[PDB]
């Protein structure tokens, strides 16, 4: 029942933005989560 | 370390404040934790 994907890279605005689209319509969640992962990956500050 | 906590009942906007306190003040991410879990506690019982 679901797995976890942490996005410790994304700032509050980005982070909040992910579920904002999701919660409006949980169908795109997987897609959104992806862009979250992808974002996390895109900027991934070490 | 790594004590997972779920915020299913909180909405993007509810969670918004959490990051804001958390990223602005990591020094209280636990006291902040309390608040999100508080909020997730607050609105939890529908």
């Amino acid at each position: 029942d679901g797995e976890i994907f942490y996005l410790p890279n994304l700032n509050p605005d980005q982070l909040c933005a992910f579920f904002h689209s999701v919660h409006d319509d949980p169908s795109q969640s997987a897609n959104l989560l992806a862009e979250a992962k992808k974002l996390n990956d895109a900027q991934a500050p070490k | 370390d790594g004590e997972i906590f779920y915020l299913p009942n909180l909405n993007p906007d509810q969670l918004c404040a959490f990051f804001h306190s958390v990223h602005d003040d990591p020094s209280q991410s636990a006291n902040l934790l309390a608040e999100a879990k508080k909020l997730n506690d607050a609105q939890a019982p529908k």
């Binding site: 679901g2 976890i4 994304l10 997987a30 | 004590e3 906590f5 915020l7 991410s29 934790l33």
Partner: peptide, 22 residues
Amino acid sequence: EGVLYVGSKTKEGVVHGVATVA
């Protein structure tokens, strides 16, 4: 069908992750 806001209480003390529920 959705994603769950999850956090993990760690060294930094709170990470914002997602539990994607199918």
